């Protein structure tokens, strides 16, 4: 990294971080399924793709290095498809600060011997009683039948109850010995994704096909490295939920103003 | 480079090139005297510093990658001091294009385990026979300690206010080949050694500002150079290669005094 004229960063998905003269930042890394076999456990209708929560994690790292408290808003566009035969240059770009302190943010990649960048995300950064217990293995079976083919690392929903319109979930990182440890991330993408698996129950209930995250608002992490979470999920309008989470000692870890889901065609994914 | 998530570039002083989402570019490289011993031959008053013409070269590479014909203006500020015990992260940043196609350019560095960037240059890009060994001896006595790679002025004549110079890269096997550069910094710098002659008769003088640098063919191995005055301590120049093809021209080069104390401060 120094050998190429750049400053290193410590993160499981990014190798470099540099502040540019205009006050913006660039982060870069190599993304290959062979170096990150845990990502193989996030497969949707036959296609292995970087989860939305991983793009969230990347933005959290940028937020942290640039001094911002919040991902204000993030929207996902074209997916990033991983396979064992391929590998991608991955980049996060952050603009300079507004007078209010807000910065644009973008995440993009391209195949190792391909020229054209593909934009996967953009957005901005700146300033339990009497509830019916769920059969979570049963939830994962039904999700699998719809195309959510979560391998061991992404089957992190251990337990769940609902009361009224709300859901409470215990999540943990599935198959620990098979990812980088959750202590190495702002929030392990499998942990945060497993927190959404519960929400998929009611949200898919009388629905045809697949629904994935496409937009998040007000993501604020208060402590990095949580290994597990107790999660309060509440509805937020149609196909949206919000959530709030403490760790096993009750310290507040992360909150999400809003996560919006949308229908995706499996054929679009096979194409990407 | 690919291993860190970046696109490589082929250049002797830069390892990477990336286009940023805003249409700007970033180039990076590591700069260590131990990997580039030819740069030890550019020493001024005891302090080894990257020559002005190397900053010009860096801009030329940026210009080329970004589709600009010309360095419109370039100004040097703090020098970049090299030593055998040190190494610098080097960075060239280019802004997005104007409607006219003009882009800002900045060059900066910082020591490998130091936090603060130092800006070395900024600007914009867009659309009678002489005894030369005698010249070098006098220049050495004043503090211009050019080693072999930078003693590239082979011959020179003046007529009227104008100067004509044959330059080559000194000690070729000890720098990267001139083919690998837009214009080998030693070649271009030797072209200025001649202009130091008349100037230093009326301390130490280095380039501080350049205007309208356009290269017409990259990779020249030697040059015949026409130098003309352009106001006081400024010259302009024009250069063809050994076959008479036009290689490079410079609207203006301004020189300024530098004190060994300023150099110690930069170190």
Question: What domains lie within chain A, and their CATH numbers?
Answer: 2-126 (3.10.129.110), 134-267 (3.10.129.120)
- Take residue B99 and report the two structure tokens written for it: 């409607």
Q: What are phi and psi of B188, to 5 degrees?
A: -65, -40
CA distance B242 to chain A (A): 36
Q: Which secondary-structure segment (H or E) carries B84?
A: none
Helix (H/G/I), strand (E/B), else coil: B179: helix
Resolution in A: 2.5
- Are A95 and B14 a contacting pair at CB < 8 A? no
- Are B3 and A95 a contacting pair at CB < 8 A? no
Across-strand partners of A244?
A232, A255
Helix (H/G/I), strand (E/B), else coil: A201: helix
The torsion of the CA quartet A262, A263, A264, A267, rounded to 10 degrees, works out to -170
Best to test chain A binding among B2, B3, B5, B8 (most A CBs inside 10 Å): B5
Contact yes or no for A222/A192 (Cβ under 8 A): no
Solved using:
X-ray
Q: Is A168 exposed, middle or buried (0-12, 13-18, 19+ CB in 10 A)?
A: middle
Contact yes or no for A152/A175 (Cβ under 8 A): yes
Helix (H/G/I), strand (E/B), else coil: B185: helix
The partner residue sitting opposite B1, judged by closest CB among A2, A4, A24, is A4
Helix (H/G/I), strand (E/B), else coil: A247: coil
Q: Is B207 exposed, middle or buried (0-12, 13-18, 19+ CB in 10 A)?
A: buried
Residue of A237, A230, A231 whose CA lies nearest to A258? A237
Q: What angle do CA A56, A79, A83 make, to 5 degrees?
A: 105
Other residues' Cβ atoms within 10 Å of the Cβ of residue A82: 22
Best to test chain B binding among A2, A6, A14, A117 (most B CBs inside 10 Å): A6
Using alpha carbons, list the distances in angstroms from residue B1 to A13, A35, A94, B162: 15, 17, 21, 47
CA distance A90 to A117: 9
Report DSSP letters for A36-61, one per residue.
-GGGGGEEETTEEB--HHHHHHHHHH
CA distance B227 to B250: 10
- Are A18 and B26 a contacting pair at CB < 8 A? yes
């Amino acid at each position: 990294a120094a050998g190429l004229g750049l400053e290193a960063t410590e993160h499981p998905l990014l190798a470099t971080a540099t502040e540019l003269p205009d006050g913006g930042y660039l982060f870069t890394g190599r993304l290959a399924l062979r170096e990150h076999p845990w990502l193989a456990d996030h497969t949707i209708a036959g296609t292995t793709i970087v989860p939305g929560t991983a793009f969230v994690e990347l933005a959290l790292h940028a937020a942290d290095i640039a001094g911002c408290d919040e991902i204000t808003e993030l929207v996902l566009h074209t997916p990033l498809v991983l396979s064992t035969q391929s590998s991608s240059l991955l980049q996060v770009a952050v603009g300079p600060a507004d007078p209010s302190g807000a910065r644009s943010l973008t995440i993009r990649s391209h195949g190792e011997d391909v020229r054209l960048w593909v934009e996967h995300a953009d957005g901005s950064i700146g300033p339990p009683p009497g509830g019916d217990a769920w059969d979570t293995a049963g939830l994962y079976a039904r999700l699998a039948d719809r195309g959510f083919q979560y391998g061991e690392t992404f089957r992190g929903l251990r337990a769940a109850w609902s009361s009224g319109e709300d859901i409470y979930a215990d999540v943990e990182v599935g198959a620990p010995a098979s990812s980088p440890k959750p202590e190495a991330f702002h929030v392990h993408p499998a942990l945060l994704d497993a927190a959404l698996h519960a929400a998929l129950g009611p949200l898919l209930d009388g629905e045809e096909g697949l629904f994935l995250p496409f937009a998040l608002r007000r993501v604020r992490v208060h402590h990095s490295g949580a290994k597990s979470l107790r999660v309060h999920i509440t509805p937020d309008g149609d196909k949206s939920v919000s959530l709030s989470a403490v760790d096993a000692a009750g310290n507040a870890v992360v909150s999400v103003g809003s996560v919006a889901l949308r229908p995706v065609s499996s054929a679009q994914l096979a194409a990407a």
